[PDB]
Design a protein around this motif. Structure first.
Motif, PDB file in Angstrom:
ATOM      1  N   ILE A  88       2.303  -8.032   4.486  1.00 16.51           N
ATOM      2  CA  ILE A  88       2.508  -6.966   5.447  1.00 16.51           C
ATOM      3  C   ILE A  88       2.703  -5.640   4.716  1.00 16.51           C
TER       4      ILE A  88
ATOM      5  N   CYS B 216       7.317  -2.337   6.741  1.00 18.94           N
ATOM      6  CA  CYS B 216       7.434  -3.437   7.695  1.00 18.94           C
ATOM      7  C   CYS B 216       8.440  -4.446   7.149  1.00 18.94           C
TER       8      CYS B 216
ATOM      9  N   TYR C  47       0.966  -5.389  13.212  1.00 17.78           N
ATOM     10  CA  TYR C  47       1.512  -6.656  12.720  1.00 17.78           C
ATOM     11  C   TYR C  47       2.607  -7.149  13.650  1.00 17.78           C
TER      12      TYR C  47
ATOM     13  N   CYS D 106       5.154  -4.201  13.803  1.00 14.30           N
ATOM     14  CA  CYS D 106       4.957  -3.110  12.850  1.00 14.30           C
ATOM     15  C   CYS D 106       3.646  -2.414  13.093  1.00 14.30           C
TER      16      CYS D 106
ATOM     17  N   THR E 204       3.263   1.036   7.169  1.00 13.25           N
ATOM     18  CA  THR E 204       3.885   0.914   8.477  1.00 13.25           C
ATOM     19  C   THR E 204       4.784   2.114   8.735  1.00 13.25           C
TER      20      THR E 204
ATOM     21  N   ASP F 291       8.380   0.603  13.660  1.00 14.62           N
ATOM     22  CA  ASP F 291       8.458  -0.782  14.112  1.00 14.62           C
ATOM     23  C   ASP F 291       9.307  -0.923  15.382  1.00 14.62           C
TER      24      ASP F 291
END
Length: 154
Positions: free
Chosen positions: A4, A8, A92, A109, A116, A119
């Motif tokens: 990821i 994130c 994500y 995310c 990222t 979130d």
């Protein structure tokens, strides 16, 4: 997809074991509560399909997503999404905890370029009238998510 983005949270040690993707990706889910919310609140309905499909009524029209497992972060999926207004983005998500039949807590995310930027935690309910469930109280207390915001579903 192996890991990821930076920004994130990997949620080490926090994600349920024994996740059954097939049972989660069947039927509708309503996004009834979330950690962060914007005005005006909305009721986003998520529909699912085979091979990790996830659709919803987004801000700018219908969104259709296809997921891929993230091998280095168990429980995470990379979703490639398109919108009817011409958007294209990656998101994500991980199912932190679910009982399949009533509720699911998700972590999401965003992605801009390779990182990222933002979130959220999302509460999915099989019923649009769903509450913050007692069944998640252990996990919500563990994650310090103790004031999830009510959105626009009822």
């Amino acid at each position: 997809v192996t890991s990821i983005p930076t920004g994130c949270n990997a949620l080490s040690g926090k994600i349920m074991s024994g996740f059954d993707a097939n049972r989660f990706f069947t039927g509708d889910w309503y996004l009834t509560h979330s950690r962060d919310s914007e005005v005006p609140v909305r009721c986003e309905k998520y529909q699912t399909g085979s091979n990790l499909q996830l659709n919803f009524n987004g801000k700018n029209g219908d969104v259709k997503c296809s997921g891929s497992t993230v091998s280095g972060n168990q429980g995470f999926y990379s979703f490639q999404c398109t919108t009817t207004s011409g958007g294209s983005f990656t998101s994500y998500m991980a199912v932190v905890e679910t009982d399949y039949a009533n509720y699911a807590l998700l972590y999401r995310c965003g992605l801009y370029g390779s990182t990222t930027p933002k979130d959220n935690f999302l509460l999915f309910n099989r019923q649009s009238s769903g509450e913050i469930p007692a069944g998640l109280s252990t996990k919500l207390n563990q994650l310090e998510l103790t004031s999830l915001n009510k959105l626009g579903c009822s």
